[PDB]
């Protein structure tokens, strides 16, 4: 919403925020190499696509398409101090015991909606490969339905027979108070 104002389009309402969310879900992708992608978009106009708001009024966006999700890898674009998702993944790995991180390097599982951009698995693998030692096999696992992985796994879990003793019954709550939840389960 903030980066689209430099082309003239101004979305300020909450409804317009929903419109911009739809634009993001339809036109944005992750660039494998950000710098030369930027130079390419500057040179030609083959990256420009068009979107039609729900009153006519087509809008055309250029390098915004990949500048929007690039923030995941350079969170300094929005004034945050953290590191990109590739770097926090690598740090979380390197915070684990040296014997399991070879098997962690090869089972990076992606989940949730924000991991649905075209080309995010390739960029992620490139970055982690550049960070990790040159002997490990980096494998990014990105299922085609990863937007509902949490719900699917939750149904699998709640269906297990060995899980039917892990519920928090009403009686346990009546005994222990709301603090039952984290104190035991």
């Amino acid at each position: 919403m903030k980066i689209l104002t430099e082309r003239g389009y101004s979305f300020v309402t909450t409804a317009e925020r929903e419109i911009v969310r739809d634009i993001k879900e339809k036109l944005c992708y992750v660039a494998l190499d950000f710098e030369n992608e930027m130079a390419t978009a500057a040179s030609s106009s083959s990256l420009e696509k068009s979107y039609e708001l729900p009153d006519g009024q087509v809008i055309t966006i250029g390098n915004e398409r990949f500048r929007c999700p690039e923030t995941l890898f350079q969170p300094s674009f929005i004034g945050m101090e953290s590191a990109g998702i590739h770097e926090t993944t690598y740090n979380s790995i390197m915070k684990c015991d040296i014997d399991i991180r070879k098997d962690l390097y090869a089972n990076n599982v992606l989940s949730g909606g924000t991991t649905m951009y075209p080309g995010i698995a390739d960029r992620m693998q490139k970055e982690i490969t550049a960070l990790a030692p040159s002997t490990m096999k980096i494998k990014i696992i990105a299922p085609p339905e990863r937007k509902y992985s949490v719900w699917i796994g939750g149904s699998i879990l709640a269906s297990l027979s060995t899980f039917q003793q892990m519920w928090i019954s009403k009686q346990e709550y009546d005994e222990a108070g709301p603090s039952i939840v984290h104190r035991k389960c």
Partner: protein, 60 residues
């Protein structure tokens, strides 16, 4: 006789005009049908083209 001759001649010509209008609106209907099917086809083709071009992008 001028009154009644203008009357019935203009009336039958008005009938011909309304039939021409019905023909014109049916032409509008068929043209609109062609337009809608063709634009839907264009939409499908364009979205598939975009999928395939980005697939070549990732592949290469």
């Amino acid at each position: 006789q001028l009154v009644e001759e203008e009357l019935d001649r203009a009336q039958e010509r008005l009938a011909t005009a309304l039939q021409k209008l019905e023909e014109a609106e049916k032409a509008a209907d068929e043209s609109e049908r062609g337009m809608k099917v063709i634009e839907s086809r264009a939409q499908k083709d364009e979205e598939k083209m975009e999928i395939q071009e980005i697939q070549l992008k990732e592949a290469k």
